[PDB]
């Protein structure tokens, strides 16, 4: 995250770290949506142009973390994967359309003060909160500049009007994506960066004071550049696939 701040303790208890076993390294962000399901970006697991295609057994899920590098004894929980599910129409060839995947955990994780699932939006919450100008919150352990943070970083960012998203890039933007960030003339700045991928863009509903994951960190052109915005997977638009996957497995 660039131009973010350190997270408060317990501020993002759904935050998940995807961790490579060997060499032990951060792979991406992710989120806890139930006691055995983790949501992430498809590209975190599968991206053939970069020869990336992880199998279950290559991965660990670290939940309840604050510190990036530290083993957080008695706080973090670490889980193994039972099964990876990638969106059958994830478009890795072209634009990362449908950049979403699920991970089922071998065993349920124990909720705690530091571990707690985020909600997934329903149509009304999405329609009510996914508006240009409304701010969301992005969290991760990614790069601070286009070095690395000591603890989880947080940044709040305004959703941007679809024409401004589209006019900011040469990539073809889909209804399965939204963009967020401040404009050059807005003074404020901030963005997701490499490492933040697969992490959550959440919003706090003013209707019932619950946190909802509206997006997934998906892609960007550099990080925190003027005139560029972060692009996020639109979670509500792919919820049917999500529900089906969970409803079936």
């Amino acid at each position: 995250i660039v131009e973010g701040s350190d997270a408060e303790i317990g501020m993002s208890p759904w935050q998940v770290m995807l961790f490579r076993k060997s060499p032990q390294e951060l792979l991406c962000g992710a989120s806890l949506i139930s006691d055995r399901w983790v949501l992430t970006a498809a590209h975190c697991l599968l991206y053939p142009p970069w020869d990336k295609n992880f199998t279950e057994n290559d991965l660990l899920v670290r939940i309840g973390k604050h510190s990036r590098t530290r083993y957080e004894r008695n706080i973090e929980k670490i889980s193994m994967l039972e099964k990876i599910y990638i969106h059958p129409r994830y478009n890795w060839r072209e634009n990362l359309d449908r950049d979403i995947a699920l991970m089922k955990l071998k065993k349920p994780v124990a909720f705690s003060d530091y571990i707690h699932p985020v909600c997934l939006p329903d149509r009304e919450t999405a329609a009510s909160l996914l508006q240009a100008g409304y701010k969301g919150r992005v969290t991760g352990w990614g790069n601070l500049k286009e070095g690395q943070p000591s603890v989880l970083q947080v940044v709040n960012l305004p959703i941007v009007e679809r024409p401004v998203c589209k006019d900011s890039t040469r990539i073809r933007i889909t209804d399965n994506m939204f963009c967020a960030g401040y404009k050059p003339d807005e003074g404020k700045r901030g963005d997701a960066c490499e490492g933040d991928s697969g992490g959550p863009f959440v919003m706090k509903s003013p209707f019932n004071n619950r946190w909802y994951q509206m997006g997934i960190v998906s892609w960007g052109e550099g990080c925190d550049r003027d005139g560029k915005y972060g692009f996020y997977t639109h979670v509500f638009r792919l919820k049917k696939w999500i529900q089906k996957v969970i409803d079936q497995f």
């Binding site: 076993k21 032990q24 390294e25 951060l26 660990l60 590098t69 530290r70 083993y71 670490i78 193994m80």
Partner: peptide, 10 residues
């Protein structure tokens, strides 16, 4: 750069 985790997790 990462502290090592319990072997049990791998």
């Amino acid at each position: 750069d990462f502290e090592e985790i319990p072997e049990e997790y791998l």
